[PDB]
Amino acid sequence: KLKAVLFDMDGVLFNSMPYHSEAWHQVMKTHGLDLSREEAYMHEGRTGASTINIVFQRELGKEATQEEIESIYHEKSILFNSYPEAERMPGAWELLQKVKSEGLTPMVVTGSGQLSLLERLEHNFPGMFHKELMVTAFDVKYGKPNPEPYLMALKKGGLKADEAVVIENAPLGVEAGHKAGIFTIAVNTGPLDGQVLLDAGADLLFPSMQTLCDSWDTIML
Amino acid sequence: KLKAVLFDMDGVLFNSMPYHSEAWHQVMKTHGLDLSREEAYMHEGRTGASTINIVFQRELGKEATQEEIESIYHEKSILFNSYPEAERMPGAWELLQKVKSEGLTPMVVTGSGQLSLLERLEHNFPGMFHKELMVTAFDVKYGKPNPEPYLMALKKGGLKADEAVVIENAPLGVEAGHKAGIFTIAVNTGPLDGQVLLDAGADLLFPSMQTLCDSWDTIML
Ligand SMILES: [Mg+2]
Numbered sequence: 069k070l071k072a073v074l075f076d077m078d079g080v081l082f083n084s085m086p087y088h089s090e091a092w093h094q095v096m097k098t099h100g101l102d103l104s105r106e107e108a109y110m111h112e113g114r115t116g117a118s119t120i121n122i123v124f125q126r127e128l129g130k131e132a133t134q135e136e137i138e139s140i141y142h143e144k145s146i147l148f149n150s151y152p153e154a155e156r157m158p159g160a161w162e163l164l165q166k167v168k169s170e171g172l173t174p175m176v177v178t179g180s181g182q183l184s185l186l187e188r189l190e191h192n193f194p195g196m197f198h199k200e201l202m203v204t205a206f207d208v209k210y211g212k213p214n215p216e217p218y219l220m221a222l223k224k225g226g227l228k229a230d231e232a233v234v235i236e237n238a239p240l241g242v243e244a245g246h247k248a249g250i251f252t253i254a255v256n257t258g259p260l261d262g263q264v265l266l267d268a269g270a271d272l273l274f275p276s277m278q279t280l281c282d283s284w285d286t287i288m289l
Numbered sequence: 290k291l292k293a294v295l296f297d298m299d300g301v302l303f304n305s306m307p308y309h310s311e312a313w314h315q316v317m318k319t320h321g322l323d324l325s326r327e328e329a330y331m332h333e334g335r336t337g338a339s340t341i342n343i344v345f346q347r348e349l350g351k352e353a354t355q356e357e358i359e360s361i362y363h364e365k366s367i368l369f370n371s372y373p374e375a376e377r378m379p380g381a382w383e384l385l386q387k388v389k390s391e392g393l394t395p396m397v398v399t400g401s402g403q404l405s406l407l408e409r410l411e412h413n414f415p416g417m418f419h420k421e422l423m424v425t426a427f428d429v430k431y432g433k434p435n436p437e438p439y440l441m442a443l444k445k446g447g448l449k450a451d452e453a454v455v456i457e458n459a460p461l462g463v464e465a466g467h468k469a470g471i472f473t474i475a476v477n478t479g480p481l482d483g484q485v486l487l488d489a490g491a492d493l494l495f496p497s498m499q500t501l502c503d504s505w506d507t508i509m510l
């Protein structure tokens with residue numbers, strides 16, 4: 069019997085990945101470094117530091133310094149913020165209402181550490197989440213694909229792994245939920261092949277958030 | 290214009306694959322041959338003759354004679370029919386009602402020559418199907434994963450490939466639908482990994498007939 073539902077924020081609650089992928093691609097290009105929009109989708113869920121390091125290690129044969137990480141990340145963040153603000157993923161508010169009406173605790177698990185997440189989550193999904201029942205960059209040392217953030221979600225909610233379900237759209241996020249020993253539902257909201265989500269260890273796979281919403285009662289039976 | 294929905298029978302309309310897999314496994318075992326239950330699921334959709342020939346080709350390094358094909362097929366079918374009759378796959382009747390209410394033509398495209406199941410279609414799905422709008426083992430030269438049975442169905446229905454959708458549960462059936470150029474929805478109703486259905490060319494994947502039914506209006510929007 070389930071108690072909690074653990075949502076990723078990017079690509080699950082907000083339709084932000086076109087923006088995250090473009091900004092990552094463009095900022096790398098500005099620095100003479102090659103990160104494709106597709107590879108940015110492959111790295112969804114990673115910390116900015118980790119993403120920057122991976123490109124530096126492959127292209128430059130070394131790690132980025134902390135000041136280079138912070139510089140490039142701030143530049144990516146400025147660019148991401150220059151775009152008209154990201155909107156709700158279709159089906160998210162509807163699934164959240166279903167989950168809540170069934171007595172389940174909605175939770176957010178995200179590697180973002182921005183304050184206005186609180187405001188933006190609350191404005192888009194009013195009454196759904198509680199800031200204390202949420203995992204952010206203020207908590208994440210390692211981040212996806214390490215199961216750390218989902219394990220910290222379990223801890224914060226006082227949950228056993230078999231009392232939760234993970235809703236994820238990205239393979240590093242699926243892998244994180246899976247390697248935490250939590251039942252993981254993949255929603256293929258991006259441009260990647262469904263196989264990549266199943267290969268990462270998803271127990272179920274749906275084509276979209278709305279189809280997950282439509283199917284929720286049936287899979288919970 | 291979507292005009293018709295092309296259903297497989299076993300694993301889609303009837304929950305018969307536990308029996309089919311068991312019967313093949315056991316009959317082969319009686320004959321001193323190795324066909325596991327899992328491999329029977331992999332060969333779902335093929336003619337009886339092809340299935341038997343594949344085992345002979347691998348295990349004995351030779352083709353099966355026609356009388357070896359005929360005897361083994363006969364034993365397997367009798368064994369299948371010794372089990373309490375296969376019941377409807379949950380979701381199938383509801384989806385059929387929905388498809389028909391939205392003006393689409395239900396069709397059966399199957400590799401089966403199992404009279405006991407074929408002749409139970411009307412009693413299980415009243416007012417849905419018609420012999421003139423069906424393709425069975427009796428209709429084909431090659432069968433799944435040859436797109437031949439699906440192309441035959443399009444002809445029978447007076448349809449083009451972009452006017453139909455295929456609902457399949459088996460890798461060789463998805464392949465057949467895909468290679469005919471028809472939009473194919475895989476429903477993972479057996480014990481195989483979902484990746485094998487996506488790899489065979491499924492445009493969409495759902496874990497069950499009921500969740501497909503639940504999601505039908507959404508994916509057709
Ligand atoms: Mg995500």
Ligand SMILES: [Mg+2]
Pocket residue numbers: 297298299300301333334457458459462
């Ligand atoms: Mg089948």
